[PDB]
């Protein structure tokens, strides 16, 4: 496997997989004009959140940076799926609830089905979705009877 990525993927997988213990799925590195950009999909058990992506990004970036084997310098780019567990039936929906998530309802609210926010409460019938006003939450109840689509979500 003599592709450039394995170096990278490995290299960065070391400070990244080890230190915050999230691990490099792959870093594949892309050419934008004159610069090279090392774009990473990284993973962890249970999914990464933003901040974990950040954390990885510390790690990929800062850590790669603190532990640079590469005498040339390029631009570290962090990607990592936000929680993407579908919102269907209770367990997944609930397993989705802890995070901000978006759900779709078919009958138009401002014409739209899908609203992301923090799950505050679950009903069998309803989904209660936090919008955060500074430090304030408001939980919005989504009738399942209206629900077109429901999922855990990406800020990506």
UniProtKB/Swiss-Prot annotation:
Keywords: Cytoplasm, Ribosome biogenesis. It is found in: Cytoplasm. InterPro entries: Ribosome_maturation_RimP, RimP_C, RimP_C_sf, RimP_N, RimP_N_sf. One of its GO terms (cellular component) is cytosol. One of its GO terms (biological process) is translation. Its main location: cytoplasm. It comes from the Bacteria. Required for maturation of 30S ribosomal subunits. Belongs to the RimP family. This is Ribosome maturation factor RimP. It comes from Staphylococcus aureus (strain bovine RF122 / ET3-1).
């Amino acid at each position: 496997m003599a592709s450039k990525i394995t170096e990278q993927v490995e290299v960065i997988v070391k400070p990244i997989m080890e230190d915050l213990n999230f691990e490099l799925v792959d870093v594949e590195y892309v050419k934008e004009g004159r610069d090279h950009f090392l774009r990473i999909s990284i993973d962890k058990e249970g999914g990464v959140d933003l901040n974990d992506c950040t954390l990885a990004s510390e790690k990929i970036s800062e850590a790669m940076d603190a532990n640079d084997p590469i005498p040339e310098m390029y631009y570290l780019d962090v990607a990592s799926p936000g929680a993407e567990r579908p919102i269907k039936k209770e367990q997944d929906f609930q397993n989705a609830i802890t995070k901000p998530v978006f759900v779709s309802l078919y009958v138009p609210i401002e014409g739209e089905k899908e609203w992301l926010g923090i799950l505050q409460e679950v009903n069998n019938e309803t989904i209660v979705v936090q919008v955060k006003i500074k430090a304030r939450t408001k939980d919005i109840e989504i009738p399942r009877d209206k629900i077109a689509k429901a999922r855990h979500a990406v800020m990506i």
